[PDB]
Amino acid sequence: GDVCQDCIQMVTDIQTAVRTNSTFVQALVEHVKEECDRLGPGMADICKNYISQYSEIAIQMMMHMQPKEICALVGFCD
Amino acid sequence: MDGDVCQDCIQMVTDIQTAVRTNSTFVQALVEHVKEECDRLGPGMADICKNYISQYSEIAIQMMMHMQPKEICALVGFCD
């Protein structure tokens, strides 16, 4: 309800940033990859690859789907 | 509505923490989604990832339930 609406708003604004802020995605992926170090040697670099892979598909499914559908995917809507 | 990603994240995390207290199964779909994208790592790693997430998801959920939404959003990169 409010959670579905809040999810839809967040997705909407992320789509807007991705489409109008050429620095947004890179800065976000780079920041998350840095947090991956928290996992320590071995696991950290896997986490980094994971983030690299997830961002590609997230930007892809988000550049192709509507926010409500993206939110339903993770159980925040419907 | 054209909003702010950082504020959206703070509100969103605030709602999730509220929904989890009401019903601890609320983030199930999200966890399954994270585990499923493990396949993007290709053969081999996909298995290391799925097992890792499967091992610490409960602990991760517990940690985040004790963290402040802004702290969580700062961690993930939507705020600051």
Curated annotation (Swiss-Prot), chain A:
Glycans are attached at residue 21. The record marks 21 as: Not glycosylated. This is Saposin-B. Coiled coil: none annotated. Disulfide bonds join 4-77, 7-71, 36-47. The chain holds residues 195 to 272 of 524 of the full protein. It comes from the Eukaryota. Changing residue 23 to I: In MLDSAPB; juvenile; affects glycosylation at N-21. Residues 1-78 form the Saposin B-type domain. The lineage of its organism: Eukaryota, Metazoa, Chordata, Craniata, Vertebrata.
